[PDB]
């Protein structure tokens, strides 16, 4: 069988971009998202970056530059325990809060927290903030889903709804919000308000506790020890949205000084490298 990886293979081999080899960036969609028109002359084109891990949600606002895009404001999902949400830091309701936390924190540093307060109450209807004359214009950014398949009800659009309710003017439509019946092509806003306030999570805690309590303890183990029940879901997120709108500013942790103690071994120098093969040759000639 002929060898596929020979000298002629690697000599002709052209590697992809590093962010492409890692599978993190889609350069076909990035070009159409971060590149600004040439008749704008360094007008920053902002975008909301929403990323999901197995335990955390990252929401950032950036604008592209040649030496790397700068992050204007970043709100993480592990900051919700400061506002009350100590459980389920990766569900749809926690995505609406980190988007709201990113919207209110951005408007704070830009001096736009008095104007464009968004929807204080959660109604689920399509809301797009309006720019009032005389006052500074609303912040207009765009959504960056990345490699996440944008289906109806994805949590990427949960932070999108949290940002447009905070005051951000992001263009979108209610076709991909949870509660859009594609059969009738109508958006039922009442279903969306349930996912925003975690009401769909409460119905799961009740469907298990009233059927078999054994599985309820495995699925919601940390929900029991933290003292949150199925009846304390809607109110928990409501008072969390209130705390986010009050103090959205995030202070950095005190810089802890470290002696920079390395835990990895260093590369072998040229002396240690040649001396090792010199010992293997000498040890090979003694055995014969």
């Amino acid at each position: 069988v002929k060898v596929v990886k020979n000298k002629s293979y690697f000599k002709r081999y052209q590697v992809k971009f590093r962010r492409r080899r890692e599978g993190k960036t889609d350069y076909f969609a990035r070009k159409r998202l971060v590149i600004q028109d040439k008749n704008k002359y360094n007008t920053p084109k902002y975008r909301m970056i929403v990323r999901f891990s197995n335990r955390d949600i990252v929401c950032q606002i950036a604008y592209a530059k040649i030496e790397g895009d700068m992050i204007v404001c970043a709100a993480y999902s592990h900051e919700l325990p400061k506002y009350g949400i100590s459980v389920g830091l990766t569900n749809y309701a926690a995505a609406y809060c980190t988007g709201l936390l990113l919207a209110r924190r951005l408007l704070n540093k830009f001096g736009l927290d008095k104007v464009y307060d968004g929807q204080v109450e959660i109604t689920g209807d399509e809301f797009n903030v309006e720019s009032i004359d005389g006052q500074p214009g609303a912040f207009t950014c765009y959504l960056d889903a990345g490699l996440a398949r944008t289906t109806t009800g994805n949590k990427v659009f949960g932070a999108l709804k949290g940002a447009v309710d905070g005051g951000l003017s992001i263009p979108h439509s209610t076709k991909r919000f949870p509660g859009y019946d594609v059969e009738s092509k109508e958006f039922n806003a009442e279903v969306h308000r349930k996912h925003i306030l975690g009401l769909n999570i409460a119905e799961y805690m009740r469907l298990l506790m009233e059927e078999d309590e054994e599985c309820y303890k495995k699925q919601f183990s940390r929900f029991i020890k933290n003292g949150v029940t199925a009846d304390s879901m809607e109110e928990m997120y409501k008072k969390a949205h209130a705390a986010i709108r009050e103090n959205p500013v995030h202070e950095k942790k005190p810089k802890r000084e470290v002696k920079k103690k390395r835990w990895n071994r260093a590369k072998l120098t040229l002396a240690q490298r040649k001396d090792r093969v010199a010992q293997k040759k000498a040890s090979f000639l003694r055995a014969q």
């Binding site: 093969v277 293997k280 040759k281 090979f284 000639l285 014969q288």
Partner: protein, 201 residues
């Protein structure tokens, strides 16, 4: 056929047999290695060439004739298993022939293949034992009369058909830098994996 005086000088760009040039007849020479070709490097230390001194092109029929002329003299003076002839010129340039005759559409059909040679390029190479030097020079001398132009019969300083000198070939064998494989040697540098170094020892 047309005499070789008409296709002696390299006037045209190289016109090889390819997808665009179809219908080329087979070259006159088809065998390039003769003698005991499956001999090791330490059997035929001597090497002698037929170096060219003119930038011209040698026909395929001349390479065939001079090969047999040098071969018939080596088999009678050194035996059929005491030499190795390697013709180092392959006929690749296709010379053209105009229609048998105005010149409306004068581009001609292929006539044959002709090997283009440079000043200093080896035409033939013969390796044999160290005591057959006077026979190879005479065998290669008789083959010059089958070629147009001027050729030189130079006894090379390399070790047979290899590219290493004779004064260094014996030292590179003891240092395991060269291993014989058929009619040539393998240059084994000191920059590979250590597994193949232990195989040599």
């Amino acid at each position: 056929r047309r005499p070789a005086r008409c296709y002696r000088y390299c006037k045209n760009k190289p016109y090889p047999k390819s997808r665009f040039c179809r219908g080329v007849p087979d070259p006159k020479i088809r065998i390039f290695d003769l003698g005991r070709k499956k001999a090791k490097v330490d059997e035929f230390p001597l090497c002698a060439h037929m170096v060219s001194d003119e930038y011209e092109q040698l026909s395929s029929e001349a390479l065939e004739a001079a090969r047999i002329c040098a071969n018939k003299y080596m088999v009678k003076t050194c035996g059929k298993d005491g030499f190795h002839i390697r013709v180092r010129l392959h006929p690749f340039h296709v010379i053209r022939i105009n229609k048998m005759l105005g010149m409306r559409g004068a581009f001609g059909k292929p006539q044959g293949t002709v090997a283009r040679v440079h000043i200093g390029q080896v035409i033939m190479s013969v390796r044999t034992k160290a005591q057959n030097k006077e026979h190879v020079i005479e065998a290669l001398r008789r083959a010059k009369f089958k070629f147009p132009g001027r050729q030189k019969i130079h006894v090379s300083k390399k070790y047979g058909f290899t590219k290493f000198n004779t004064c260094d070939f014996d030292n590179m064998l003891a240092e395991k830098r060269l291993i014989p494989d058929g009619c040539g040697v393998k240059y084994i540098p000191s920059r590979g994996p250590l597994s193949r170094w232990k195989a040599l020892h």
